[PDB]
Write a protein that holds these residues in place. Structure first.
Motif, PDB file in Angstrom:
ATOM      1  N   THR A  91     -25.488  20.350 -38.572  1.00 28.43           N
ATOM      2  CA  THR A  91     -24.299  20.886 -39.162  1.00 28.43           C
ATOM      3  C   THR A  91     -23.778  22.055 -38.356  1.00 28.43           C
ATOM      4  N   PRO A  92     -22.468  22.170 -38.218  1.00 24.72           N
ATOM      5  CA  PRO A  92     -21.934  23.344 -37.527  1.00 24.72           C
ATOM      6  C   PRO A  92     -22.169  24.620 -38.325  1.00 24.72           C
ATOM      7  N   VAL A  93     -22.316  25.733 -37.609  1.00 21.08           N
ATOM      8  CA  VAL A  93     -22.681  27.024 -38.189  1.00 21.08           C
ATOM      9  C   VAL A  93     -21.628  28.070 -37.847  1.00 21.08           C
ATOM     10  N   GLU A  94     -21.159  28.801 -38.853  1.00 18.51           N
ATOM     11  CA  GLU A  94     -20.267  29.934 -38.654  1.00 18.51           C
ATOM     12  C   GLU A  94     -21.027  31.151 -38.180  1.00 18.51           C
ATOM     13  N   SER A  95     -20.455  31.858 -37.225  1.00 16.43           N
ATOM     14  CA  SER A  95     -21.033  33.077 -36.704  1.00 16.43           C
ATOM     15  C   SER A  95     -20.046  34.219 -36.928  1.00 16.43           C
ATOM     16  N   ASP A  96     -20.433  35.420 -36.494  1.00 12.13           N
ATOM     17  CA  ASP A  96     -19.505  36.536 -36.538  1.00 12.13           C
ATOM     18  C   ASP A  96     -18.276  36.292 -35.683  1.00 12.13           C
ATOM     19  N   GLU A  97     -18.379  35.439 -34.662  1.00 11.27           N
ATOM     20  CA  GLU A  97     -17.292  35.263 -33.715  1.00 11.27           C
ATOM     21  C   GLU A  97     -16.505  33.968 -33.867  1.00 11.27           C
ATOM     22  N   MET A  98     -17.034  32.987 -34.583  1.00  7.55           N
ATOM     23  CA  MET A  98     -16.437  31.667 -34.607  1.00  7.55           C
ATOM     24  C   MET A  98     -16.669  31.062 -35.969  1.00  7.55           C
ATOM     25  N   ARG A  99     -15.641  30.396 -36.469  1.00 12.34           N
ATOM     26  CA  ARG A  99     -15.776  29.613 -37.684  1.00 12.34           C
ATOM     27  C   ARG A  99     -15.461  28.157 -37.356  1.00 12.34           C
ATOM     28  N   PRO A 100     -16.400  27.221 -37.500  1.00 15.88           N
ATOM     29  CA  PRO A 100     -16.104  25.804 -37.244  1.00 15.88           C
ATOM     30  C   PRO A 100     -15.454  25.147 -38.442  1.00 15.88           C
ATOM     31  N   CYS A 101     -14.597  24.165 -38.166  1.00 14.11           N
ATOM     32  CA  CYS A 101     -13.928  23.437 -39.229  1.00 14.11           C
ATOM     33  C   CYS A 101     -13.524  22.066 -38.723  1.00 14.11           C
ATOM     34  N   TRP A 102     -13.689  21.059 -39.576  1.00 14.91           N
ATOM     35  CA  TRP A 102     -13.198  19.721 -39.292  1.00 14.91           C
ATOM     36  C   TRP A 102     -11.731  19.607 -39.673  1.00 14.91           C
ATOM     37  N   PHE A 103     -10.981  18.890 -38.851  1.00 13.38           N
ATOM     38  CA  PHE A 103      -9.596  18.548 -39.117  1.00 13.38           C
ATOM     39  C   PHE A 103      -9.437  17.040 -39.036  1.00 13.38           C
ATOM     40  N   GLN A 104      -8.746  16.465 -40.004  1.00 10.58           N
ATOM     41  CA  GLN A 104      -8.377  15.060 -39.885  1.00 10.58           C
ATOM     42  C   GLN A 104      -7.443  14.880 -38.688  1.00 10.58           C
ATOM     43  N   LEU A 105      -7.456  13.669 -38.109  1.00  7.61           N
ATOM     44  CA  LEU A 105      -6.691  13.428 -36.893  1.00  7.61           C
ATOM     45  C   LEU A 105      -5.202  13.209 -37.132  1.00  7.61           C
ATOM     46  N   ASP A 106      -4.749  13.299 -38.377  1.00  9.21           N
ATOM     47  CA  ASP A 106      -3.334  13.449 -38.696  1.00  9.21           C
ATOM     48  C   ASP A 106      -2.975  14.874 -39.115  1.00  9.21           C
ATOM     49  N   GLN A 107      -3.881  15.817 -38.899  1.00  9.05           N
ATOM     50  CA  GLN A 107      -3.722  17.226 -39.252  1.00  9.05           C
ATOM     51  C   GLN A 107      -4.256  18.097 -38.118  1.00  9.05           C
ATOM     52  N   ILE A 108      -4.046  17.675 -36.877  1.00  4.88           N
ATOM     53  CA  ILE A 108      -4.518  18.487 -35.747  1.00  4.88           C
ATOM     54  C   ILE A 108      -3.696  19.763 -35.709  1.00  4.88           C
TER      55      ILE A 108
END
Ligand SMILES: Nc1[nH]c(=O)nc2c1ncn2[C@H]1C[C@H](O)[C@@H](COP(=O)(O)OP(=O)(O)OP(=O)(O)O)O1
Ligand code: NA
Ligand code: NA
Ligand code: NA
Length: 153
Positions: A91-108
């Motif tokens: 699973t992706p992990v949020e850090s102090d410097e970066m927040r990961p997030c999934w986007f649907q490919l009709d919502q890039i």
């Protein structure tokens, strides 16, 4: 011609969604990556940055493009090697410097991405390989660019 420093950029692209990271410290979404280090291959540097910045590991990556960035007022070019993978571990992990997030490919979220992404990321989605160059004034303005689909990166 200016000297260039090597960077990686990794796009985790699944059939219906893409994983991006938001710079927290800012406001722009991007793939994962950073400077290649002494003695590692570019692909290994891309895997390392993906793990350091997102927590995700991957066995391998596919090279899909190369983009050179020039910034007015900066002495070096950034030579960015772009990789994709569809297969993840963890699973992706949020850090102090970066927040990961999934986007649907009709919502890039192009408006909140680097401006160049609007040009090359459509090619990536079509399974195309590319070489690009973009000259920026600051973070928002492109003064010159080249882009070409290629058969081999
Ligand atoms: N115009 C642009 N469009 C784009 O899509 N990605 C860009 C870009 N310009 C830079 N990048 C990417 C390339 C690379 O993944 C990242 C820049 O590397 P960083 O400065 O994040 O390197 P590092 O993580 O080594 O740095 P530090 O964490 O400051 O040590 O941003
Ligand atoms: Na990094
Ligand atoms: Na780094
Ligand atoms: Na980085």
């Amino acid at each position: 011609m200016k000297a260039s420093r090597l960077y990686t950029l990794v796009l985790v692209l699944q059939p219906q969604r893409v994983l991006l990271g938001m710079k927290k410290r800012a406001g722009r979404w991007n793939g994962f990556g950073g400077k290649v280090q002494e003695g590692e291959t570019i692909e290994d540097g891309a895997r390392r940055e993906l793990q350091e910045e997102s927590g995700l590991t991957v066995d391998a990556l596919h090279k899909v493009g190369q983009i050179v960035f020039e910034f007015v007022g900066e002495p070096e070019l950034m030579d960015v090697h772009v990789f994709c993978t569809d297969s993840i571990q963890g699973t992706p992990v949020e850090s102090d410097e970066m927040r990961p997030c999934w986007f649907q490919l009709d919502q890039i979220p192009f408006k909140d991405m680097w401006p160049d992404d609007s040009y090359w990321f459509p090619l990536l989605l079509q399974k195309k390989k590319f070489h690009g160059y973009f000259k920026f004034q600051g973070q928002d303005t492109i003064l010159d660019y080249t882009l070409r689909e290629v058969d081999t990166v």
